[PDB]
Design an enzyme around this catalytic site. Sequence first.
Site, PDB file in Angstrom:
ATOM      1  N   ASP B 110       1.211  -1.176  -0.098  1.00 20.68           N
ATOM      2  CA  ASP B 110       0.036   0.114   0.249  1.00 20.68           C
ATOM      3  C   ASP B 110       1.024   1.035  -0.254  1.00 20.68           C
ATOM      4  OD1 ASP B 110      -2.170  -1.710  -0.084  1.00 20.68           O
ATOM      5  OD2 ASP B 110      -3.905  -0.446   1.708  1.00 20.68           O
ATOM      6  N   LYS B 162      -3.810   8.391  17.970  1.00 18.57           N
ATOM      7  CA  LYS B 162      -4.561   9.953  17.841  1.00 18.57           C
ATOM      8  C   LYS B 162      -3.399  10.849  19.185  1.00 18.57           C
ATOM      9  CE  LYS B 162      -6.815   7.381  16.111  1.00 18.57           C
ATOM     10  NZ  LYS B 162      -6.733   6.422  15.641  1.00 18.57           N
ATOM     11  N   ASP B 218       0.914   6.723   1.747  1.00 19.87           N
ATOM     12  CA  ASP B 218      -0.412   5.199   1.957  1.00 19.87           C
ATOM     13  C   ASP B 218      -1.027   5.199   0.710  1.00 19.87           C
ATOM     14  OD1 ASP B 218      -0.710   2.783   2.982  1.00 19.87           O
ATOM     15  OD2 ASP B 218      -2.534   3.613   3.093  1.00 19.87           O
TER      16      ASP B 218
HETATM   17  N1  LIG Z   1      -1.107 -12.082   4.899  1.00 17.18           N
HETATM   18  C1  LIG Z   1      -2.354 -10.953   5.465  1.00 17.18           C
HETATM   19  N2  LIG Z   1      -1.821  -9.239   5.147  1.00 17.18           N
HETATM   20  C2  LIG Z   1      -2.922  -8.798   5.508  1.00 17.18           C
HETATM   21  C3  LIG Z   1      -3.712  -8.827   6.247  1.00 17.18           C
HETATM   22  N3  LIG Z   1      -4.481  -7.940   6.449  1.00 17.18           N
HETATM   23  C4  LIG Z   1      -3.165  -6.957   6.160  1.00 17.18           C
HETATM   24  N4  LIG Z   1      -2.533  -7.499   5.310  1.00 17.18           N
HETATM   25  C5  LIG Z   1      -1.536  -6.768   4.384  1.00 17.18           C
HETATM   26  O1  LIG Z   1      -1.637  -5.190   5.101  1.00 17.18           O
HETATM   27  C6  LIG Z   1      -1.468  -3.769   4.204  1.00 17.18           C
HETATM   28  C7  LIG Z   1      -2.783  -3.280   4.667  1.00 17.18           C
HETATM   29  O2  LIG Z   1      -3.564  -3.559   5.292  1.00 17.18           O
HETATM   30  P1  LIG Z   1      -5.473  -4.075   3.987  1.00 17.18           P
HETATM   31  O3  LIG Z   1      -5.753  -5.258   4.708  1.00 17.18           O
HETATM   32  O4  LIG Z   1      -4.728  -3.925   2.734  1.00 17.18           O
HETATM   33  O5  LIG Z   1      -5.823  -2.502   4.790  1.00 17.18           O
HETATM   34  P2  LIG Z   1      -7.640  -2.852   5.187  1.00 17.18           P
HETATM   35  O6  LIG Z   1      -8.512  -3.243   4.086  1.00 17.18           O
HETATM   36  O7  LIG Z   1      -8.355  -1.827   5.183  1.00 17.18           O
HETATM   37  O8  LIG Z   1      -7.229  -4.026   6.595  1.00 17.18           O
HETATM   38  P3  LIG Z   1      -6.419  -3.716   7.961  1.00 17.18           P
HETATM   39  O9  LIG Z   1      -6.414  -4.259   7.904  1.00 17.18           O
HETATM   40  O10 LIG Z   1      -6.528  -3.068   9.293  1.00 17.18           O
HETATM   41  O11 LIG Z   1      -5.074  -1.908   7.077  1.00 17.18           O
HETATM   42  C8  LIG Z   1      -1.263  -4.555   3.483  1.00 17.18           C
HETATM   43  O12 LIG Z   1       0.021  -5.191   3.298  1.00 17.18           O
HETATM   44  C9  LIG Z   1      -1.628  -5.173   3.314  1.00 17.18           C
HETATM   45  O13 LIG Z   1      -1.500  -6.500   2.480  1.00 17.18           O
HETATM   46  C10 LIG Z   1      -4.160 -10.458   5.913  1.00 17.18           C
HETATM   47  O14 LIG Z   1      -4.937 -11.037   6.760  1.00 17.18           O
HETATM   48  N5  LIG Z   1      -3.035 -11.508   6.047  1.00 17.18           N
HETATM   49 MG   LIG Z   2      -2.509   1.257   3.421  1.00 20.39          MG
END
Ligand SMILES: Nc1nc2c(ncn2[C@@H]2O[C@H](COP(=O)(O)OP(=O)(O)OP(=O)(O)O)[C@@H](O)[C@H]2O)c(=O)[nH]1
Ligand SMILES: [Mg+2]
Lengths: 366, 366
Positions: B110, B162, B218
Site C-alpha cells: 500500500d 491520536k 499510503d
Molecule cells: N497476509 C495478510 N496480509 C494482510 C492482512 N491484513 C492486512 N494485511 C496487509 O496489511 C497492509 C494494509 O492492510 P489492508 O488489509 O490492505 O487494509 P484494510 O483492508 O483496510 O485492513 P487493515 O488490515 O485494518 O489495514 C497490506 O499490506 C495488507 O496486505 C491479512 O489478513 N493477511
Molecule cells: Mg495501506
Amino acid sequence: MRAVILVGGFGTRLRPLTLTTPKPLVPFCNKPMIIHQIEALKAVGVTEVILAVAYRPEAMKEQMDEWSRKLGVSFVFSVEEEPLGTAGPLALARDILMQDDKPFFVLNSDVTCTFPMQELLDFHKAHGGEGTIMVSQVTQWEKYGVVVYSPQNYQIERFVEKPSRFLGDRINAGIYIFNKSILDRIPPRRASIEKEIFPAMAAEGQLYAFNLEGFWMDVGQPKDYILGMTKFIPSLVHGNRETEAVEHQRGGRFTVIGASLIDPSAKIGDGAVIGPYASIGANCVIGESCRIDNAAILENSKVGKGTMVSRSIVGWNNRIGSWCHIKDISVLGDDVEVKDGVILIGTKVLPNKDVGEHRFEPGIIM
Amino acid sequence: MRAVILVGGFGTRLRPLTLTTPKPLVPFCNKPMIIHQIEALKAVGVTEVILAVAYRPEAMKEQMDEWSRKLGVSFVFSVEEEPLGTAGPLALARDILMQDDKPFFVLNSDVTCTFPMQELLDFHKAHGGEGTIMVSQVTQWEKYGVVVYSPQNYQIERFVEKPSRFLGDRINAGIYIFNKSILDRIPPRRASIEKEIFPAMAAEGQLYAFNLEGFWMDVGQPKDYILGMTKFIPSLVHGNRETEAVEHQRGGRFTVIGASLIDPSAKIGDGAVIGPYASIGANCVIGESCRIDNAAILENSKVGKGTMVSRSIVGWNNRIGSWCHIKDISVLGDDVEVKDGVILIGTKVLPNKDVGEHRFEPGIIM
Ligand SMILES: Nc1nc2c(ncn2[C@@H]2O[C@H](COP(=O)(O)OP(=O)(O)OP(=O)(O)O)[C@@H](O)[C@H]2O)c(=O)[nH]1
Ligand SMILES: [Mg+2]
Ligand SMILES: Nc1nc2c(ncn2[C@@H]2O[C@H](COP(=O)(O)OP(=O)(O)OP(=O)(O)O)[C@@H](O)[C@H]2O)c(=O)[nH]1
Ligand SMILES: [Mg+2]
C-alpha cells in the site's frame, strides 16, 4: 387595416433576459418575437402597426425597431406612456386610431403560433369583436388559469380562473380583432382587457371566440420559451435558410440531430452536436465538442469546447467556459461569464455576473 | 537476501476496485503496486520475494503474477492461508524463510515512495531491526493516528494513537527490515505487527526508526491514491516512455498540461486535454474533447467525447458516456457503464452497474 401590439410590460417572468431588453425584443429562435408577429401582419397586408411602448420608452424600443426600414412596414410610436395596464393603451391610442370604420387587430408580444389571420374575412357575422377572443385547446388549462367557455354559438358566457369543474379546455390566445367602437368602452386610465373589459363584453354578449387549429404557445416564461421553440422550429425550418439537418456544414464538420436554426455568421466548432430544436444566434462561436440539445444561444455568445447546454437560455454577450453543463431550465443574463467545469442546474443568473461555483439546484445568482 | 510482501488483506478502503482484484494488483499509474515494490527490490538485488496471500489465494494472485517470468525475480507463493492478521504470515513463513543468518525485508503493498533501500547497508549498528520501523514526516499525523516517537538515539519509546500532545510528526512508512530472530517472537496465530509485535519490540528496546527524506504515501484510500499519484508521476516521467508533456503525439492532436502516463496502446482523442498527473491504461480509448484532470483510467476503458473526469478513478472495463462529469473523489467498479450527461460528484459505483442518474452528493451506487 391596422394593428396594435401591446409591447409594454416589465417582462417579469422572463426577468433575467428582460432586465436588458424589453420582452418584445427578446430574440425567439433568431428573431425578436414582435418581428415574427409583424411579419405575419405584413403577410396579411397590414401596413400600420401601433406599439404601446411603456417599458424602455426610447432607449430600446424606438432605436432597436429599425426593422421599419425593412419589412415594408411602418410603426407609429405614439403610445409612449406611464404603465397603463393591458387595456389603457387602447384608450390612449384612440386618437391615433382615428375611430375609422375599419376594424383593427390587437396582439400580445408573448404569443407564437401559425398565426391564422383569416379571422379578418371570417367571423364578420355581426360581432362586436370578429371572433376577437381567440382561444386554443390546452390540456393544462388548470395551471394556465384562464378558461374561456365557448359554446357552439361562440357567445362567451363568462371567464373562470382555475375552474374546479370541467367547463372547457379553451384558453385565451392573446390575438384579438376589434371594431373601433370598443374605444368608447375603454376608460382613459389603468385597466386590464383580460379582467375589466372582457367580462363586460362577455356579459353584454358582444364577445365571440375564435378557435385555433394549429399550435400555440405563450412564450413569456423560460419553460414555455423552450417548449414553444420546440413546437415552432419545425414550422420555420423550410421557411428560412438556417438529410436530418438544417445547417449541417456551417463550420468544420458537426452533427445535427434534428431541426435547428444556426445563423450563417455563427461558427460551429468541429465535431459539435447541435441537437433538436436549437437556436444559434449571429456571430456566436461554438466549441469543438459542444452539445446544444434544446438551448438557445443569443447574439455574440461564446461557448467553450465540451460544454453541454440543454433546455437552457444563454444571454447576448456571454462567455461560457469549456466543460460546463447548463441543464434544466436555466437562464443567463446579458454578460454572464461562466468558468470551466461549472454546472448550473436550472439557475437564473442576472446580467453582468461571473459564475465560478457549481449550483446543483434551481436558484437565482444575484 | 529475501523480502516478504504482505499481499493479503481485504482492501476495505479501496473497496470498489478491490472487489475484483486484490489490493496489491490494483494498477497504480500503469503498473500494479506490488510491481513497483518488486522493481525497487530487484534494483536493490533481492531475488526471492515471499507473498503472504490470503485474499484471492490462487484465482487472482497466482494467475496474474506472471511477472515472475519478467523482472528476473521469483515468488515463493507458499503462504496461502486463512486470514492471519498482519504479523501471522511471518510466523507461517518461518519455515520457508529457513531462519538463515541474513536479515529479510518486509513490505506492505500500500506504500509508494522513492524506496530508499540503502537501509540494508546502513543501520546495521546493533539493531534487532536495522531501522526497521521506517518513518515519514507528515503534518497531518492526527488523522493518520500512528505516531512514532523517534529520538536522536532512534530507540522507539512507544506508539501513540491520536496523540493530543505534539510528541512527534513521524508516522509508520510500512517498510521494515528484520533479523530472523524475530521469527521466535511472532506466535503462530492471528496477530498484528503494528499493535502486538511492534509495541513489544519498542518496550524491549530492539526497535529502531529509519527516517525517510523523500516523498511517501499510503495509497490504500482513493483520496490518498489520487494524491500519491500526483506525488509519484513526476518522479516516473523520465523513467518510462509514457515540451510540457510526457506523451503528446500518441493519438491525433491533444494537449498535456503537466506530467502524465499514457500507455502506447491507448488512443487519445483528437482535441483532448490530458491534464497534470493523469494515468491512461492500456487499450483505453479517449474521446475527442475529453478532460483527464487528475484521473486514473484503467485498462480497457472507453470515454466519450466531452467527458471530464477529475481526481477520480475508473475501473478496468468501463464505458463512460459522452458528456459526463466524474468529479471529486469518485471510484468506479470493474464494469460500470455511464450514460451520456450523467454527473457523479464523488460517488463510488460497485462493479457491473449501469448509471443513468445524476448524483450531486458523495455516496455509493450499489
Ligand atoms: N497476509 C495478510 N496480509 C494482510 C492482512 N491484513 C492486512 N494485511 C496487509 O496489511 C497492509 C494494509 O492492510 P489492508 O488489509 O490492505 O487494509 P484494510 O483492508 O483496510 O485492513 P487493515 O488490515 O485494518 O489495514 C497490506 O499490506 C495488507 O496486505 C491479512 O489478513 N493477511
Ligand atoms: Mg495501506
Ligand atoms: N403597453 C402596456 N402593455 C402591457 C402592460 N402590461 C402588460 N402589457 C402587455 O401584456 C402582455 C403580457 O404581459 P407582460 O407584462 O409581458 O407579462 P408580465 O410582465 O408577467 O405582467 P402581466 O402579464 O401584465 O401580469 C404583453 O403584450 C405586454 O406587452 C403595460 O403596462 N403597458
Ligand atoms: Mg404572455
